Amino acid sequence: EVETFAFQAEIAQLMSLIINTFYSNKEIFLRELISNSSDALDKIRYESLTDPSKLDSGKELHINLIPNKQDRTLTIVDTGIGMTKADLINNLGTIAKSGTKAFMEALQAGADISMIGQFGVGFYSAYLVAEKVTVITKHNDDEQYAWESSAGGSFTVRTDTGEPMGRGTKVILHLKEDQTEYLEERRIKEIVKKHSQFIGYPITLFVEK
Ligand SMILES: CNC(=S)Nc1ccc(F)cc1F
């Protein structure tokens, strides 16, 4: 049972701008997704300060980076607060309509795509390097869901029958054919050291057979 939704016009416009603008500094997608994971981890940590049972779904607070060259995927896993179905549909828990408006206003006032995270829509920088993005998520107050989009104006949401995650979010980047440098260990390490050196959660880069 799969539900298909239209993006709001402004988000479709943001995604087409990210996909079609010539902009060589694509590596910032990873900084933006790690920053989103850190924000999600901060949220569940804050809730746990007054209600420890919020961590019954998992006490460890971390970020894993999992490249898979066979599948041509880079997955960013975190054990943060996750998202409900309603959050997923409402632009993955962002204020993306007003964030896109602010981002566009900034781009015409000198900004570049790398500043996208300052406008709360850094998730969509995934489409700098991915032809398709799958988001698997589990929030304490809802069931596990999979969101997916290859852009083109629509996204899908379905109940996820995959491996249970406990709590958190997994962003699966199905990389464009010419963006496979982001599966190479040395390239991912370089990006994490350059842009994510002060993130307050352990970031583990998995290796492959
Ligand atoms: C009321 N909001 C304002 S003033 N926002 C705003 C956003 C991006 C800019 F580049 C300039 C801006 F003024």
- The full set of domain ranges for the chain reads 2-205
Q: Is the CB of 49 under 6 A from ligand 1?
A: no
Distance 125 CA to ligand 1 centre (A): 21
Contact in structure between 10 and 94 (CB atoms under 8 Å): no
Contact in structure between 88 and 137 (CB atoms under 8 Å): yes
**Amino acid of residue 22:** F
**What is the position in ligand 1's atom list of the atom closest to the CA of 111?**
10
CA distance 144 to 140: 9
What is the residue whose two structure tokens read 């490249």? 67
Q: Is the CB of 110 under 6 A from ligand 1?
A: no
Domain 2-205 has CATH 3.30.565.10: yes
What is the residue whose two structure tokens read 């699966």? 172
Three-class DSSP labels, 131-195: EEEEEEEECCCCCCEEEEECCCCEEEEEECCCCCCCCEEEEEEEECHHHHHHHCHHHHHHHHHHH
**What is the position in ligand 1's atom list of the atom closest to the CA of 103?**
8
Contact in structure between 198 and 58 (CB atoms under 8 Å): no
Helices (H), the chain: 9-20, 28-50, 85-89, 96-107, 185-195
CA distance 27 to 118: 16
Token pair in block for residue 166: 């406990």
Distance 19 CA to ligand 1 centre (A): 24
Measured in angstroms, the resolution is 1.6
**What is the position in ligand 1's atom list of the atom closest to the CA of 106?**
10
Q: Is the CB of 98 under 6 A from ligand 1?
A: no
42 is in an annotated binding site: no
Residue nearest to atom 9 of ligand 1 (CA): 106
**Amino acid of residue 158:** R
Q: Is the CB of 106 under 6 A from ligand 1?
A: yes
**Amino acid of residue 53:** S
Distance 195 CA to ligand 1 centre (A): 25
Method: X-ray
Distance 100 CA to ligand 1 centre (A): 11
* Phi, psi torsion values for 44, nearest 5 degrees: -70, -35
